[PDB]
Amino acid sequence: MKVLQEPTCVSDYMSISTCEWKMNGPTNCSTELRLLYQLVFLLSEAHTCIPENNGGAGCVCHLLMDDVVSADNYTLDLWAGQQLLWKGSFKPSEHVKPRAPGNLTVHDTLLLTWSNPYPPDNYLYNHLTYAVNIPADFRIYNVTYLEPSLRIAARARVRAWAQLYNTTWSEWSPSTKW
Amino acid sequence: DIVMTQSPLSLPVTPGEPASISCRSSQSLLYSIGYNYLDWYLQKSGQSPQLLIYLGSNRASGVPDRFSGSGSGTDFTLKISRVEAEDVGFYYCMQALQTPYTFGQGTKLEIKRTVAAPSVFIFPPSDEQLKSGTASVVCLLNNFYPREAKVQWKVDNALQSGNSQESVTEQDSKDSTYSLSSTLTLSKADYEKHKVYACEVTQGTTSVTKSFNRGE
Amino acid sequence: EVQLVESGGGLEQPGGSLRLSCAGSGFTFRDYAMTWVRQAPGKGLEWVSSISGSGGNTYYADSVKGRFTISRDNSKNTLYLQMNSLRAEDTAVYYCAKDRLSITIRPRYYGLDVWGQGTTVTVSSASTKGPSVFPLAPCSRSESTAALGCLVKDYFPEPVTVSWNSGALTSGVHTFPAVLQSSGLYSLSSVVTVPSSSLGTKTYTCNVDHKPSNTKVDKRVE
Ligand SMILES: *[C@@H]1O[C@H](CO)[C@@H](O[C@@H]2O[C@H](CO)[C@@H](O)[C@H](O)[C@H]2NC(C)=O)[C@H](O)[C@H]1NC(C)=O
Ligand SMILES: *[C@@H]1O[C@H](CO)[C@@H](O[C@@H]2O[C@H](CO)[C@@H](O)[C@H](O)[C@H]2NC(C)=O)[C@H](O)[C@H]1NC(C)=O
Ligand SMILES: *[C@@H]1O[C@H](CO)[C@@H](O)[C@H](O)[C@H]1NC(C)=O
Numbered sequence: 001m002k003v004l005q006e007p008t009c010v011s012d013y014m015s016i017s018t019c020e021w022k023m024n025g026p027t028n029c030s031t032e033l034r035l036l037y038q039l040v041f042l043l044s045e046a047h048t049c050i051p052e053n054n055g056g057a058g059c060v061c062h063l064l065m066d067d068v069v070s071a072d073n074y075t076l077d078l079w080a081g082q083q084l085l086w087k088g089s090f091k092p093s094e095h096v097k098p099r100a101p102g103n104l105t106v107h108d109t110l111l112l113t114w115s116n117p118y119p120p121d122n123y124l125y126n127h128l129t130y131a132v133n134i135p136a137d138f139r140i141y142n143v144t145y146l147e148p149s150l151r152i153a154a155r156a157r158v159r160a161w162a163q164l165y166n167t168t169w170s171e172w173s174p175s176t177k178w
Numbered sequence: 179d180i181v182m183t184q185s186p187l188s189l190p191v192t193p194g195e196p197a198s199i200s201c202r203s204s205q206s207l208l209y210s211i212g213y214n215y216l217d218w219y220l221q222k223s224g225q226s227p228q229l230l231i232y233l234g235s236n237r238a239s240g241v242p243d244r245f246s247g248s249g250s251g252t253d254f255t256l257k258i259s260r261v262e263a264e265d266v267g268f269y270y271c272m273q274a275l276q277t278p279y280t281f282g283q284g285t286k287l288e289i290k291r292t293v294a295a296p297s298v299f300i301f302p303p304s305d306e307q308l309k310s311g312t313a314s315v316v317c318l319l320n321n322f323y324p325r326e327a328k329v330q331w332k333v334d335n336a337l338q339s340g341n342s343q344e345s346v347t348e349q350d351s352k353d354s355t356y357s358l359s360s361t362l363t364l365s366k367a368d369y370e371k372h373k374v375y376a377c378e379v380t381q382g383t384t385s386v387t388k389s390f391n392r393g394e
Numbered sequence: 395e396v397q398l399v400e401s402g403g404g405l406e407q408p409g410g411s412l413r414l415s416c417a418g419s420g421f422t423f424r425d426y427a428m429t430w431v432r433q434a435p436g437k438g439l440e441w442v443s444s445i446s447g448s449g450g451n452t453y454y455a456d457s458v459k460g461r462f463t464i465s466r467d468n469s470k471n472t473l474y475l476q477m478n479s480l481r482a483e484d485t486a487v488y489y490c491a492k493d494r495l496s497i498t499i500r501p502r503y504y505g506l507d508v509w510g511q512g513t514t515v516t517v518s519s520a521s522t523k524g525p526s527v528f529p530l531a532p533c534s535r536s537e538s539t540a541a542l543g544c545l546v547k548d549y550f551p552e553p554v555t556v557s558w559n560s561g562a563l564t565s566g567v568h569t570f571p572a573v574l575q576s577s578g579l580y581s582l583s584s585v586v587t588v589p590s591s592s593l594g595t596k597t598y599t600c601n602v603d604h605k606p607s608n609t610k611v612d613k614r615v616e
Pocket of ligand 1: 028
């Protein structure tokens with residue numbers, strides 16, 4: 001057993017942080033491997049994540065995050081039984097896939113409302129810019145103010161981008177028909 | 179390790195007046211925004227330390243609204259809005275970011291109150307003590323200010339010197355006074371030889387002298 | 395409430411070993427990190443050692459690295475500092491404290507918010523002597539307010555804890571700091587003040603404890 005492609009992680013910057021790796025030869029991750037991790041901070045405790053299978057040779061871990069701030073950095077250790085396979089670290093804030101926006105409602109004026117999925121005390125609270133798609137062919141609308149609304153006169157879904165570097169688009173929201 | 183520099187060492191103040199203690203670390207103790215790792219403790223002498231303020235400016239449960247934390251990075255300040263008699267003691271700051279946890283030097287808080295005369299009491303040695311051949315005579319000055327005072331032992335008008343030790347308490351938390359005990363040590367031989375024992379408490383323009391006669 | 399109670403302090407020889415203990419109640423011991431702090435006489439606080447709530451990580455001050463050992467039992471809710479090969483400047487009063495919640499992915503720290511009562515370690519080549527307790531009573535010629543007390547002479551090492559009427563009388567008590575007599579022993583007094591009136595009715599006992607000799611002395615004073 002050997003690591004073919006070293007662990008790589010992507011957090012939603014609040015609660016979850018998905019770490020994936022590929023292996024030389026097929027593994028049952030659920031049984032053979034165990035990935036321990038510890039937030040690099042005084043008097044913390046390491047914790048245990050039992051992985052799952054992404055095909056034969058590939059594994060995936062949903063590490064629980066106690067929220068994430070920029071400063072955070074975690075020590076990752078991959079074990080097979082009692083054999084260390086791999087040593088490493090990662091900052092979750094450094095590879096981000098934003099969570100999807102929420103309850104997309106409708107309303108002269110045509111008002112669309114949604115929920116920012118992050119709470120007031122979170123960094124992504126006021127660092128999300130929204131994209132709105134509008135059947136046959138469509139048209140987009142880039143919302144770049146803090147308010148999660150849109151107005152006009154005369155499928156329909158919403159997504160989210162974050163003011164970061166190693167970022168991507170959120171999944172689309174549940175969609176309504178105007 | 180992070181050097182904490184606490185200032186001042188000495189803080190005389192007056193009850194009801196405001197008071198301030200500075201604290202400068204040799205590096206930033208902020209981890210994230212809102213999270214500085216700087217704490218404030220008080221210790222009344224004889225007692226275990228107790229937390230006033232955690233994480234820069236959060237009040238410990240038990241701590242009145244009068245005590246306020248403030249500061250960020252490397253600059254911390256503890257404010258007391260109006261001092262009180264039970265604020266007396268020793269104040270410490272502590273970084274809790276990196277081991278080793280380091281402490282500021284410490285501030286002695288001392289109340290300037292008005293002058294007080296001691297109640298003065300004299301005590302003979304116990305009958306129980308004289309068997310062991312040592313006679314101890316104890317003078318006590320109760321609830322006075324200030325800590326400065328001249329106690330002199332006299333044995334039949336004879337001014338004893340260098341056969342006595344003293345001890346003072348910390349400043350009282352209720353009435354801000356001091357108490358002092360003075361102890362004279364004799365051979366049983368000496369205690370029988372003489373009769374009249376007295377201790378003179380001298381303060382300002384006053385000299386109280388309590389006495390006893392081994393007879394009565 | 396939520397309490398920490400310490401034990402295991404006394405006089406040990408230069409080169410000896412001692413084991414400190416910290417009983418803790420009112421929470422989940424295991425959830426929390428713990429810390430040992432020490433205070434030399436006259437001098438200020440000094441962090442000694444720390445340990446995570448699992449037992450996982452330990453942290454040691456330099457001057458004790460290799461010598462002292464931190465350990466915990468989370469079933470018995472107890473924490474130990476295993477002091478080994480002691481030197482003279484290990485002489486200090488030792489406190490333990492509730493540090494950070496460590497169970498969770500991110501620690502939560504609200505200061506050292508609960509403190510133990512302390513316990514004393516003295517590292518010396520002289521021998522431990524339990525105390526002598528003599529009463530302090532006025533010489534009577536028949537005052538509104540009377541002054542009683544107990545004198546506590548010839549003991550080693552420190553400390554002594556003094557009480558009045560098994561804790562029931564607090565008002566007017568002054569227990570003096572101990573001085574060193576040139577013979578190398580400690581002396582200490584404890585005095586109280588009472589009304590003249592209640593002298594005939596009430597009774598007046600002082601409770602001396604000297605854990606380092608396991609001696610406990612009670613003197614009814616007259
Ligand atoms: C990884 O191994 C585990 C344990 O062998 C597999 O899950 C179980 O397999 C046993 C037989 O060993 C079955 O009888 C159980 O009913 C299975 N339990 C569950 C909850 O599925 C697992 O299928 C293996 N995975 C892979 C990808 O090979
Ligand atoms: C995250 O924390 C880890 C601590 O495990 C850091 O990794 C160490 O970095 C130092 C750099 O001075 C090296 O000397 C060590 O070899 C590393 N040790 C281990 C155990 O990983 C890392 O620097 C931190 N930073 C980032 C960006 O992840
Ligand atoms: C993006 O990823 C690389 C990983 O090597 C890192 O060096 C870079 O600085 C990351 N992003 C940010 C925002 O710093």
